[PDB]
Amino acid sequence: DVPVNLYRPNAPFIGKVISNEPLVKEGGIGIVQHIKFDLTGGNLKYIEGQSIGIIPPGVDKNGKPEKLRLYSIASTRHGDDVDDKTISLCVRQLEYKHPESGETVYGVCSTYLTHIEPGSEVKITGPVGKEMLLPDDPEANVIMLATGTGIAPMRTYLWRMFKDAERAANPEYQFKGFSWLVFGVPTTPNILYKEELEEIQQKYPDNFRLTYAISREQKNPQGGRMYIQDRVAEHADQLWQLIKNQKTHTYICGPRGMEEGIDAALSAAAAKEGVTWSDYQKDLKKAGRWHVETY
Ligand SMILES: Cc1cc2nc3c(=O)[nH]c(=O)nc-3n(C[C@H](O)[C@H](O)[C@H](O)COP(=O)(O)OP(=O)(O)OC[C@H]3O[C@@H](n4cnc5c(N)ncnc54)[C@H](O)[C@@H]3O)c2cc1C
């Protein structure tokens, strides 16, 4: 049922860029772009939580063709225009320190994508992944813990759950549960999709809670910069209580380095009721209710 590998690296789908828009507002750190691709002409279908591969042009330092890089799909199965004709990505331009031969280094595929022009053809593969799928149950609770581009799959979930056009297109999925997004970024201008996320919280105050962890603007009780792990610790008992519900699902996504703090917080909460989080978590993973995609 779940679409998988409709297009593979040896014969990718050739899509066309429709738009490439900035998500980081002035005063923010780095570059993160929302890129929408045209899927007409092919049969690439996908669902929320999946990823697609992008094969950038050029050869590596060894003269070998560049391989695909995976990106979390940022649009619902219907696409941003709810027409089943497109797919979108949330791409950060990778750039780092000097200790890597040279001054500032720029990632190959991410630089290619963030600077791509509308009308350009792109090699797409996939979709792939069955790790971050949303339950079909409209009454399930969904906890979303993300940092930076990890917001991508969360956008697919939230749009499907709360966009007027999505609700009209998905008769069988009228979400009535509770969703809680804890989103961490360095600055307010870095809050990806800020306007729309807050619009959703304003319309669905009882079905969606939005919590931010803005490192350069907030301090945790210890005096350090505020990170998602700090917000999880702050609401550890609540999150644990929600996780105990047989229908609750939790999703973690974004650059690695977030899980350790999250487990420490939940472990302390569960321990108060004589439960070993690490064991409870293993059962949740086995049951398909604890979803993780870090990179
Ligand atoms: C399932 C999955 C989903 C993903 N989803 C997304 C998404 O939605 N959005 C998104 O932007 N990315 C996403 N990523 C990451 C993405 O696939 C690419 O890894 C990333 O975009 C960088 O690729 P590149 O081609 O730009 O870099 P490359 O040109 O391959 O550069 C990366 C390499 O350079 C080195 N490097 C990277 N950072 C540093 C650093 N700070 N210091 C030193 N060396 C470093 C490493 O050797 C790394 O292998 C996802 C990854 C996975 C696995």
Side-chain angles (χ1 to χ4, degrees), residues 51 56 66 69-73 89-97 99-100 106-111 149-150 152-153 293-295:
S51 302
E66 288 287 355
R69 269 72 159 175
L70 291 174
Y71 292 95
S72 306
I73 297 174
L89 296 183
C90 176
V91 186
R92 178 180 80 72
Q93 177 176 204
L94 170 62
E95 59 180 60
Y96 50 99
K97 54 188 179 180
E100 286 300 303
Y106 296 110
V108 176
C109 199
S110 61
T111 298
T149 53
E293 180 189 304
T294 53
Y295 47 82

PDB file of all heavy atoms in Angstrom, residues 51 56 66 69-73 89-97 99-100 106-111 149-150 152-153 293-295, ligand 1:
ATOM      1  N   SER A  51      10.695  10.204   2.383  1.00  0.00           N
ATOM      2  CA  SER A  51      11.787  11.011   1.854  1.00  0.00           C
ATOM      3  C   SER A  51      11.966  10.712   0.374  1.00  0.00           C
ATOM      4  O   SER A  51      11.426   9.734  -0.147  1.00  0.00           O
ATOM      5  CB  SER A  51      13.111  10.666   2.553  1.00  0.00           C
ATOM      6  OG  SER A  51      13.052  10.844   3.956  1.00  0.00           O
ATOM      7  N   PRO A  56      22.606  15.219  -7.439  1.00  0.00           N
ATOM      8  CA  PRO A  56      23.177  16.458  -7.971  1.00  0.00           C
ATOM      9  C   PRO A  56      24.138  16.178  -9.119  1.00  0.00           C
ATOM     10  O   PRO A  56      24.683  15.081  -9.230  1.00  0.00           O
ATOM     11  CB  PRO A  56      23.884  17.044  -6.760  1.00  0.00           C
ATOM     12  CG  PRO A  56      24.439  15.818  -6.103  1.00  0.00           C
ATOM     13  CD  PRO A  56      23.275  14.829  -6.183  1.00  0.00           C
ATOM     14  N   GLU A  66      28.393  11.997  -8.584  1.00  0.00           N
ATOM     15  CA  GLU A  66      27.825  12.251  -7.265  1.00  0.00           C
ATOM     16  C   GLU A  66      26.628  11.335  -7.046  1.00  0.00           C
ATOM     17  O   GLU A  66      25.842  11.099  -7.964  1.00  0.00           O
ATOM     18  CB  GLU A  66      27.378  13.711  -7.146  1.00  0.00           C
ATOM     19  CG  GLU A  66      28.516  14.715  -7.053  1.00  0.00           C
ATOM     20  CD  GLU A  66      29.229  14.687  -5.709  1.00  0.00           C
ATOM     21  OE1 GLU A  66      28.787  13.953  -4.798  1.00  0.00           O
ATOM     22  OE2 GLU A  66      30.234  15.414  -5.559  1.00  0.00           O
ATOM     23  N   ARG A  69      21.329  12.165  -2.383  1.00  0.00           N
ATOM     24  CA  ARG A  69      21.261  12.619  -1.003  1.00  0.00           C
ATOM     25  C   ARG A  69      19.771  12.561  -0.702  1.00  0.00           C
ATOM     26  O   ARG A  69      18.954  12.919  -1.557  1.00  0.00           O
ATOM     27  CB  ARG A  69      21.742  14.063  -0.846  1.00  0.00           C
ATOM     28  CG  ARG A  69      23.218  14.230  -0.535  1.00  0.00           C
ATOM     29  CD  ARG A  69      24.102  13.915  -1.730  1.00  0.00           C
ATOM     30  NE  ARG A  69      25.407  14.551  -1.573  1.00  0.00           N
ATOM     31  CZ  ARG A  69      26.430  14.378  -2.403  1.00  0.00           C
ATOM     32  NH1 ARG A  69      26.309  13.581  -3.454  1.00  0.00           N
ATOM     33  NH2 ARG A  69      27.573  15.015  -2.187  1.00  0.00           N
ATOM     34  N   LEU A  70      19.414  12.101   0.491  1.00  0.00           N
ATOM     35  CA  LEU A  70      18.009  12.011   0.876  1.00  0.00           C
ATOM     36  C   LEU A  70      17.529  13.283   1.557  1.00  0.00           C
ATOM     37  O   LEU A  70      18.276  13.933   2.284  1.00  0.00           O
ATOM     38  CB  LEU A  70      17.788  10.833   1.826  1.00  0.00           C
ATOM     39  CG  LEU A  70      17.945   9.430   1.245  1.00  0.00           C
ATOM     40  CD1 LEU A  70      17.837   8.419   2.377  1.00  0.00           C
ATOM     41  CD2 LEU A  70      16.882   9.171   0.189  1.00  0.00           C
ATOM     42  N   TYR A  71      16.266  13.620   1.314  1.00  0.00           N
ATOM     43  CA  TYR A  71      15.637  14.794   1.912  1.00  0.00           C
ATOM     44  C   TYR A  71      14.224  14.429   2.345  1.00  0.00           C
ATOM     45  O   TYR A  71      13.483  13.787   1.604  1.00  0.00           O
ATOM     46  CB  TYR A  71      15.609  15.946   0.905  1.00  0.00           C
ATOM     47  CG  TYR A  71      16.987  16.471   0.608  1.00  0.00           C
ATOM     48  CD1 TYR A  71      17.704  16.010  -0.501  1.00  0.00           C
ATOM     49  CD2 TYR A  71      17.619  17.353   1.483  1.00  0.00           C
ATOM     50  CE1 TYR A  71      19.020  16.406  -0.721  1.00  0.00           C
ATOM     51  CE2 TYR A  71      18.934  17.757   1.273  1.00  0.00           C
ATOM     52  CZ  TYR A  71      19.631  17.275   0.170  1.00  0.00           C
ATOM     53  OH  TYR A  71      20.941  17.643  -0.024  1.00  0.00           O
ATOM     54  N   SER A  72      13.862  14.830   3.557  1.00  0.00           N
ATOM     55  CA  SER A  72      12.530  14.551   4.079  1.00  0.00           C
ATOM     56  C   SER A  72      11.525  15.320   3.236  1.00  0.00           C
ATOM     57  O   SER A  72      11.731  16.499   2.947  1.00  0.00           O
ATOM     58  CB  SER A  72      12.417  15.023   5.529  1.00  0.00           C
ATOM     59  OG  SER A  72      13.442  14.473   6.333  1.00  0.00           O
ATOM     60  N   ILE A  73      10.446  14.659   2.829  1.00  0.00           N
ATOM     61  CA  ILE A  73       9.429  15.340   2.041  1.00  0.00           C
ATOM     62  C   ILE A  73       8.788  16.359   2.972  1.00  0.00           C
ATOM     63  O   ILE A  73       8.540  16.068   4.143  1.00  0.00           O
ATOM     64  CB  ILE A  73       8.388  14.345   1.508  1.00  0.00           C
ATOM     65  CG1 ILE A  73       9.080  13.352   0.566  1.00  0.00           C
ATOM     66  CG2 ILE A  73       7.288  15.084   0.759  1.00  0.00           C
ATOM     67  CD1 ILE A  73       8.198  12.225   0.087  1.00  0.00           C
ATOM     68  N   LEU A  89      10.468  20.201  -0.788  1.00  0.00           N
ATOM     69  CA  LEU A  89      11.554  19.903   0.135  1.00  0.00           C
ATOM     70  C   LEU A  89      11.901  21.149   0.944  1.00  0.00           C
ATOM     71  O   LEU A  89      11.599  22.276   0.538  1.00  0.00           O
ATOM     72  CB  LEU A  89      12.797  19.432  -0.632  1.00  0.00           C
ATOM     73  CG  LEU A  89      12.671  18.120  -1.406  1.00  0.00           C
ATOM     74  CD1 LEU A  89      14.023  17.784  -2.044  1.00  0.00           C
ATOM     75  CD2 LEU A  89      12.238  17.004  -0.463  1.00  0.00           C
ATOM     76  N   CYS A  90      12.538  20.921   2.087  1.00  0.00           N
ATOM     77  CA  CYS A  90      12.983  21.965   3.008  1.00  0.00           C
ATOM     78  C   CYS A  90      14.487  21.711   3.129  1.00  0.00           C
ATOM     79  O   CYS A  90      14.931  20.860   3.907  1.00  0.00           O
ATOM     80  CB  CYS A  90      12.277  21.775   4.354  1.00  0.00           C
ATOM     81  SG  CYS A  90      12.785  22.904   5.649  1.00  0.00           S
ATOM     82  N   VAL A  91      15.266  22.457   2.351  1.00  0.00           N
ATOM     83  CA  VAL A  91      16.711  22.254   2.286  1.00  0.00           C
ATOM     84  C   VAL A  91      17.620  23.333   2.868  1.00  0.00           C
ATOM     85  O   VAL A  91      17.556  24.496   2.469  1.00  0.00           O
ATOM     86  CB  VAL A  91      17.130  22.046   0.815  1.00  0.00           C
ATOM     87  CG1 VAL A  91      18.608  21.689   0.730  1.00  0.00           C
ATOM     88  CG2 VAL A  91      16.269  20.965   0.175  1.00  0.00           C
ATOM     89  N   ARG A  92      18.494  22.928   3.787  1.00  0.00           N
ATOM     90  CA  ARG A  92      19.450  23.849   4.397  1.00  0.00           C
ATOM     91  C   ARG A  92      20.751  23.795   3.597  1.00  0.00           C
ATOM     92  O   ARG A  92      21.200  22.710   3.220  1.00  0.00           O
ATOM     93  CB  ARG A  92      19.737  23.431   5.842  1.00  0.00           C
ATOM     94  CG  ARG A  92      20.769  24.298   6.556  1.00  0.00           C
ATOM     95  CD  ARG A  92      20.985  23.818   7.983  1.00  0.00           C
ATOM     96  NE  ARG A  92      21.885  22.672   8.052  1.00  0.00           N
ATOM     97  CZ  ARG A  92      23.197  22.742   7.850  1.00  0.00           C
ATOM     98  NH1 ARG A  92      23.763  23.908   7.564  1.00  0.00           N
ATOM     99  NH2 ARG A  92      23.944  21.649   7.941  1.00  0.00           N
ATOM    100  N   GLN A  93      21.354  24.945   3.309  1.00  0.00           N
ATOM    101  CA  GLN A  93      22.624  24.906   2.595  1.00  0.00           C
ATOM    102  C   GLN A  93      23.685  24.542   3.620  1.00  0.00           C
ATOM    103  O   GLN A  93      23.863  25.247   4.613  1.00  0.00           O
ATOM    104  CB  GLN A  93      22.993  26.253   1.961  1.00  0.00           C
ATOM    105  CG  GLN A  93      24.366  26.168   1.281  1.00  0.00           C
ATOM    106  CD  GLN A  93      24.792  27.422   0.542  1.00  0.00           C
ATOM    107  OE1 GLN A  93      25.614  27.356  -0.375  1.00  0.00           O
ATOM    108  NE2 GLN A  93      24.260  28.566   0.946  1.00  0.00           N
ATOM    109  N   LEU A  94      24.385  23.438   3.384  1.00  0.00           N
ATOM    110  CA  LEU A  94      25.431  23.003   4.298  1.00  0.00           C
ATOM    111  C   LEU A  94      26.713  23.795   4.079  1.00  0.00           C
ATOM    112  O   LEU A  94      27.178  23.939   2.953  1.00  0.00           O
ATOM    113  CB  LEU A  94      25.733  21.515   4.104  1.00  0.00           C
ATOM    114  CG  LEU A  94      26.976  21.021   4.853  1.00  0.00           C
ATOM    115  CD1 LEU A  94      26.787  21.184   6.352  1.00  0.00           C
ATOM    116  CD2 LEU A  94      27.227  19.567   4.508  1.00  0.00           C
ATOM    117  N   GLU A  95      27.272  24.315   5.164  1.00  0.00           N
ATOM    118  CA  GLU A  95      28.521  25.062   5.097  1.00  0.00           C
ATOM    119  C   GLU A  95      29.180  24.977   6.462  1.00  0.00           C
ATOM    120  O   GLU A  95      28.503  25.057   7.488  1.00  0.00           O
ATOM    121  CB  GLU A  95      28.271  26.521   4.699  1.00  0.00           C
ATOM    122  CG  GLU A  95      27.367  27.305   5.623  1.00  0.00           C
ATOM    123  CD  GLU A  95      27.181  28.733   5.149  1.00  0.00           C
ATOM    124  OE1 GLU A  95      26.671  28.926   4.025  1.00  0.00           O
ATOM    125  OE2 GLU A  95      27.549  29.663   5.898  1.00  0.00           O
ATOM    126  N   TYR A  96      30.498  24.800   6.482  1.00  0.00           N
ATOM    127  CA  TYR A  96      31.198  24.675   7.751  1.00  0.00           C
ATOM    128  C   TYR A  96      32.625  25.207   7.837  1.00  0.00           C
ATOM    129  O   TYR A  96      33.160  25.789   6.893  1.00  0.00           O
ATOM    130  CB  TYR A  96      31.191  23.213   8.196  1.00  0.00           C
ATOM    131  CG  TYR A  96      31.648  22.239   7.135  1.00  0.00           C
ATOM    132  CD1 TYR A  96      32.950  21.744   7.132  1.00  0.00           C
ATOM    133  CD2 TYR A  96      30.773  21.796   6.143  1.00  0.00           C
ATOM    134  CE1 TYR A  96      33.370  20.828   6.172  1.00  0.00           C
ATOM    135  CE2 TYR A  96      31.183  20.877   5.179  1.00  0.00           C
ATOM    136  CZ  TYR A  96      32.483  20.397   5.202  1.00  0.00           C
ATOM    137  OH  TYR A  96      32.894  19.477   4.264  1.00  0.00           O
ATOM    138  N   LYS A  97      33.216  24.973   9.007  1.00  0.00           N
ATOM    139  CA  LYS A  97      34.567  25.386   9.381  1.00  0.00           C
ATOM    140  C   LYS A  97      35.685  25.265   8.348  1.00  0.00           C
ATOM    141  O   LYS A  97      35.479  24.813   7.222  1.00  0.00           O
ATOM    142  CB  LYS A  97      34.977  24.629  10.647  1.00  0.00           C
ATOM    143  CG  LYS A  97      34.840  23.118  10.526  1.00  0.00           C
ATOM    144  CD  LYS A  97      35.065  22.422  11.861  1.00  0.00           C
ATOM    145  CE  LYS A  97      34.910  20.914  11.728  1.00  0.00           C
ATOM    146  NZ  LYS A  97      35.131  20.209  13.022  1.00  0.00           N
ATOM    147  N   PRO A  99      38.924  23.667   9.128  1.00  0.00           N
ATOM    148  CA  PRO A  99      39.605  22.371   9.234  1.00  0.00           C
ATOM    149  C   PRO A  99      39.007  21.267   8.368  1.00  0.00           C
ATOM    150  O   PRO A  99      38.582  20.225   8.867  1.00  0.00           O
ATOM    151  CB  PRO A  99      39.523  22.057  10.729  1.00  0.00           C
ATOM    152  CG  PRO A  99      38.272  22.753  11.152  1.00  0.00           C
ATOM    153  CD  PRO A  99      38.391  24.074  10.439  1.00  0.00           C
ATOM    154  N   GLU A 100      38.991  21.519   7.063  1.00  0.00           N
ATOM    155  CA  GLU A 100      38.477  20.592   6.064  1.00  0.00           C
ATOM    156  C   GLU A 100      38.994  21.053   4.707  1.00  0.00           C
ATOM    157  O   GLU A 100      38.271  21.036   3.712  1.00  0.00           O
ATOM    158  CB  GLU A 100      36.946  20.587   6.059  1.00  0.00           C
ATOM    159  CG  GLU A 100      36.318  19.871   7.243  1.00  0.00           C
ATOM    160  CD  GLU A 100      36.726  18.413   7.323  1.00  0.00           C
ATOM    161  OE1 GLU A 100      36.497  17.676   6.340  1.00  0.00           O
ATOM    162  OE2 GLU A 100      37.276  18.005   8.368  1.00  0.00           O
ATOM    163  N   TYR A 106      31.213  24.274   1.190  1.00  0.00           N
ATOM    164  CA  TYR A 106      29.799  24.211   0.830  1.00  0.00           C
ATOM    165  C   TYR A 106      29.363  22.828   0.351  1.00  0.00           C
ATOM    166  O   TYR A 106      29.962  22.258  -0.563  1.00  0.00           O
ATOM    167  CB  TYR A 106      29.493  25.249  -0.255  1.00  0.00           C
ATOM    168  CG  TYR A 106      29.692  26.679   0.198  1.00  0.00           C
ATOM    169  CD1 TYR A 106      30.750  27.445  -0.289  1.00  0.00           C
ATOM    170  CD2 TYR A 106      28.838  27.258   1.138  1.00  0.00           C
ATOM    171  CE1 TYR A 106      30.957  28.751   0.148  1.00  0.00           C
ATOM    172  CE2 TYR A 106      29.034  28.564   1.583  1.00  0.00           C
ATOM    173  CZ  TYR A 106      30.096  29.304   1.083  1.00  0.00           C
ATOM    174  OH  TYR A 106      30.298  30.593   1.523  1.00  0.00           O
ATOM    175  N   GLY A 107      28.315  22.296   0.977  1.00  0.00           N
ATOM    176  CA  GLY A 107      27.805  20.989   0.599  1.00  0.00           C
ATOM    177  C   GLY A 107      27.388  20.953  -0.857  1.00  0.00           C
ATOM    178  O   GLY A 107      26.756  21.886  -1.351  1.00  0.00           O
ATOM    179  N   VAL A 108      27.731  19.869  -1.546  1.00  0.00           N
ATOM    180  CA  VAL A 108      27.414  19.729  -2.961  1.00  0.00           C
ATOM    181  C   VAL A 108      25.932  19.734  -3.326  1.00  0.00           C
ATOM    182  O   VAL A 108      25.478  20.600  -4.077  1.00  0.00           O
ATOM    183  CB  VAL A 108      28.051  18.447  -3.546  1.00  0.00           C
ATOM    184  CG1 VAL A 108      27.636  18.269  -5.000  1.00  0.00           C
ATOM    185  CG2 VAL A 108      29.566  18.532  -3.433  1.00  0.00           C
ATOM    186  N   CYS A 109      25.178  18.770  -2.808  1.00  0.00           N
ATOM    187  CA  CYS A 109      23.764  18.689  -3.144  1.00  0.00           C
ATOM    188  C   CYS A 109      22.927  19.815  -2.554  1.00  0.00           C
ATOM    189  O   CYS A 109      22.022  20.321  -3.217  1.00  0.00           O
ATOM    190  CB  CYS A 109      23.184  17.340  -2.711  1.00  0.00           C
ATOM    191  SG  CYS A 109      21.624  16.923  -3.548  1.00  0.00           S
ATOM    192  N   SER A 110      23.217  20.210  -1.316  1.00  0.00           N
ATOM    193  CA  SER A 110      22.432  21.274  -0.695  1.00  0.00           C
ATOM    194  C   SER A 110      22.668  22.632  -1.335  1.00  0.00           C
ATOM    195  O   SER A 110      21.751  23.447  -1.408  1.00  0.00           O
ATOM    196  CB  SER A 110      22.694  21.357   0.817  1.00  0.00           C
ATOM    197  OG  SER A 110      24.048  21.652   1.110  1.00  0.00           O
ATOM    198  N   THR A 111      23.889  22.888  -1.801  1.00  0.00           N
ATOM    199  CA  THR A 111      24.174  24.168  -2.448  1.00  0.00           C
ATOM    200  C   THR A 111      23.486  24.170  -3.808  1.00  0.00           C
ATOM    201  O   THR A 111      22.918  25.174  -4.231  1.00  0.00           O
ATOM    202  CB  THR A 111      25.685  24.387  -2.634  1.00  0.00           C
ATOM    203  OG1 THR A 111      26.321  24.422  -1.351  1.00  0.00           O
ATOM    204  CG2 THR A 111      25.941  25.704  -3.357  1.00  0.00           C
ATOM    205  N   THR A 149      15.735  21.666   9.937  1.00  0.00           N
ATOM    206  CA  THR A 149      15.037  21.025   8.829  1.00  0.00           C
ATOM    207  C   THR A 149      14.217  19.808   9.239  1.00  0.00           C
ATOM    208  O   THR A 149      13.464  19.262   8.432  1.00  0.00           O
ATOM    209  CB  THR A 149      16.007  20.631   7.684  1.00  0.00           C
ATOM    210  OG1 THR A 149      17.096  19.852   8.200  1.00  0.00           O
ATOM    211  CG2 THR A 149      16.554  21.886   7.006  1.00  0.00           C
ATOM    212  N   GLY A 150      14.368  19.388  10.492  1.00  0.00           N
ATOM    213  CA  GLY A 150      13.599  18.264  10.997  1.00  0.00           C
ATOM    214  C   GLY A 150      12.120  18.611  11.005  1.00  0.00           C
ATOM    215  O   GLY A 150      11.266  17.754  11.236  1.00  0.00           O
ATOM    216  N   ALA A 152      10.479  19.355   8.483  1.00  0.00           N
ATOM    217  CA  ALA A 152       9.910  18.834   7.235  1.00  0.00           C
ATOM    218  C   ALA A 152       8.785  17.800   7.359  1.00  0.00           C
ATOM    219  O   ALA A 152       7.680  18.029   6.863  1.00  0.00           O
ATOM    220  CB  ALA A 152      11.036  18.298   6.327  1.00  0.00           C
ATOM    221  N   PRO A 153       9.039  16.647   8.001  1.00  0.00           N
ATOM    222  CA  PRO A 153       7.934  15.688   8.100  1.00  0.00           C
ATOM    223  C   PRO A 153       6.796  16.218   8.961  1.00  0.00           C
ATOM    224  O   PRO A 153       5.637  15.877   8.737  1.00  0.00           O
ATOM    225  CB  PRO A 153       8.595  14.449   8.705  1.00  0.00           C
ATOM    226  CG  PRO A 153       9.703  15.024   9.530  1.00  0.00           C
ATOM    227  CD  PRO A 153      10.260  16.111   8.626  1.00  0.00           C
ATOM    228  N   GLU A 293      14.049   9.854  12.942  1.00  0.00           N
ATOM    229  CA  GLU A 293      14.784  10.056  11.702  1.00  0.00           C
ATOM    230  C   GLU A 293      15.762  11.194  11.941  1.00  0.00           C
ATOM    231  O   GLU A 293      15.403  12.365  11.822  1.00  0.00           O
ATOM    232  CB  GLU A 293      13.847  10.421  10.549  1.00  0.00           C
ATOM    233  CG  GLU A 293      14.576  10.651   9.232  1.00  0.00           C
ATOM    234  CD  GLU A 293      13.670  11.217   8.159  1.00  0.00           C
ATOM    235  OE1 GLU A 293      12.629  10.591   7.871  1.00  0.00           O
ATOM    236  OE2 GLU A 293      13.998  12.287   7.603  1.00  0.00           O
ATOM    237  N   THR A 294      16.993  10.854  12.307  1.00  0.00           N
ATOM    238  CA  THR A 294      18.006  11.870  12.550  1.00  0.00           C
ATOM    239  C   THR A 294      19.133  11.672  11.553  1.00  0.00           C
ATOM    240  O   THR A 294      19.318  10.573  11.032  1.00  0.00           O
ATOM    241  CB  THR A 294      18.536  11.804  13.994  1.00  0.00           C
ATOM    242  OG1 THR A 294      18.980  10.474  14.286  1.00  0.00           O
ATOM    243  CG2 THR A 294      17.439  12.197  14.969  1.00  0.00           C
ATOM    244  N   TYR A 295      19.885  12.733  11.288  1.00  0.00           N
ATOM    245  CA  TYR A 295      20.947  12.655  10.296  1.00  0.00           C
ATOM    246  C   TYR A 295      22.064  13.669  10.503  1.00  0.00           C
ATOM    247  O   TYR A 295      22.927  13.776   9.602  1.00  0.00           O
ATOM    248  CB  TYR A 295      20.317  12.842   8.916  1.00  0.00           C
ATOM    249  CG  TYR A 295      19.344  14.009   8.845  1.00  0.00           C
ATOM    250  CD1 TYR A 295      19.794  15.315   8.659  1.00  0.00           C
ATOM    251  CD2 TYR A 295      17.971  13.800   8.967  1.00  0.00           C
ATOM    252  CE1 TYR A 295      18.898  16.390   8.594  1.00  0.00           C
ATOM    253  CE2 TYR A 295      17.066  14.863   8.903  1.00  0.00           C
ATOM    254  CZ  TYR A 295      17.537  16.155   8.717  1.00  0.00           C
ATOM    255  OH  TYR A 295      16.641  17.201   8.652  1.00  0.00           O
TER     256      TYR A 295
HETATM  257  C1  LIG B   1      16.475  10.463   5.977  1.00  0.00           C
HETATM  258  C2  LIG B   1      17.181  11.793   5.768  1.00  0.00           C
HETATM  259  C3  LIG B   1      16.431  12.912   5.618  1.00  0.00           C
HETATM  260  C4  LIG B   1      17.043  14.137   5.416  1.00  0.00           C
HETATM  261  N1  LIG B   1      16.266  15.201   5.280  1.00  0.00           N
HETATM  262  C5  LIG B   1      16.773  16.394   5.050  1.00  0.00           C
HETATM  263  C6  LIG B   1      15.879  17.598   4.906  1.00  0.00           C
HETATM  264  O1  LIG B   1      14.651  17.574   4.947  1.00  0.00           O
HETATM  265  N2  LIG B   1      16.520  18.809   4.682  1.00  0.00           N
HETATM  266  C7  LIG B   1      17.895  18.952   4.620  1.00  0.00           C
HETATM  267  O2  LIG B   1      18.404  20.064   4.445  1.00  0.00           O
HETATM  268  N3  LIG B   1      18.659  17.825   4.797  1.00  0.00           N
HETATM  269  C8  LIG B   1      18.176  16.588   4.986  1.00  0.00           C
HETATM  270  N4  LIG B   1      19.012  15.534   5.194  1.00  0.00           N
HETATM  271  C9  LIG B   1      20.521  15.604   4.983  1.00  0.00           C
HETATM  272  C10 LIG B   1      20.773  15.577   3.483  1.00  0.00           C
HETATM  273  O3  LIG B   1      20.575  14.283   2.968  1.00  0.00           O
HETATM  274  C11 LIG B   1      22.227  15.812   3.031  1.00  0.00           C
HETATM  275  O4  LIG B   1      23.115  15.064   3.923  1.00  0.00           O
HETATM  276  C12 LIG B   1      22.652  17.268   3.342  1.00  0.00           C
HETATM  277  O5  LIG B   1      21.728  18.075   2.612  1.00  0.00           O
HETATM  278  C13 LIG B   1      24.017  17.608   2.957  1.00  0.00           C
HETATM  279  O6  LIG B   1      24.268  17.075   1.627  1.00  0.00           O
HETATM  280  P1  LIG B   1      25.243  17.864   0.645  1.00  0.00           P
HETATM  281  O7  LIG B   1      25.219  17.156  -0.598  1.00  0.00           O
HETATM  282  O8  LIG B   1      24.807  19.254   0.718  1.00  0.00           O
HETATM  283  O9  LIG B   1      26.666  17.688   1.378  1.00  0.00           O
HETATM  284  P2  LIG B   1      28.166  16.709   1.153  1.00  0.00           P
HETATM  285  O10 LIG B   1      28.557  17.540   0.008  1.00  0.00           O
HETATM  286  O11 LIG B   1      28.074  15.237   1.076  1.00  0.00           O
HETATM  287  O12 LIG B   1      28.764  17.173   2.448  1.00  0.00           O
HETATM  288  C14 LIG B   1      28.518  16.357   3.535  1.00  0.00           C
HETATM  289  C15 LIG B   1      29.788  15.746   3.984  1.00  0.00           C
HETATM  290  O13 LIG B   1      30.755  16.756   4.411  1.00  0.00           O
HETATM  291  C16 LIG B   1      31.119  16.560   5.816  1.00  0.00           C
HETATM  292  N5  LIG B   1      30.442  17.565   6.776  1.00  0.00           N
HETATM  293  C17 LIG B   1      29.125  17.992   6.921  1.00  0.00           C
HETATM  294  N6  LIG B   1      28.934  18.866   7.896  1.00  0.00           N
HETATM  295  C18 LIG B   1      30.208  19.060   8.477  1.00  0.00           C
HETATM  296  C19 LIG B   1      30.699  19.898   9.594  1.00  0.00           C
HETATM  297  N7  LIG B   1      29.973  20.733  10.392  1.00  0.00           N
HETATM  298  N8  LIG B   1      32.009  19.829   9.885  1.00  0.00           N
HETATM  299  C20 LIG B   1      32.785  19.007   9.139  1.00  0.00           C
HETATM  300  N9  LIG B   1      32.471  18.194   8.096  1.00  0.00           N
HETATM  301  C21 LIG B   1      31.133  18.264   7.806  1.00  0.00           C
HETATM  302  C22 LIG B   1      30.791  15.026   5.994  1.00  0.00           C
HETATM  303  O14 LIG B   1      31.891  14.241   5.463  1.00  0.00           O
HETATM  304  C23 LIG B   1      29.474  14.851   5.211  1.00  0.00           C
HETATM  305  O15 LIG B   1      29.393  13.496   4.764  1.00  0.00           O
HETATM  306  C24 LIG B   1      18.456  14.270   5.374  1.00  0.00           C
HETATM  307  C25 LIG B   1      19.213  13.089   5.536  1.00  0.00           C
HETATM  308  C26 LIG B   1      18.619  11.888   5.711  1.00  0.00           C
HETATM  309  C27 LIG B   1      19.546  10.691   5.870  1.00  0.00           C
END
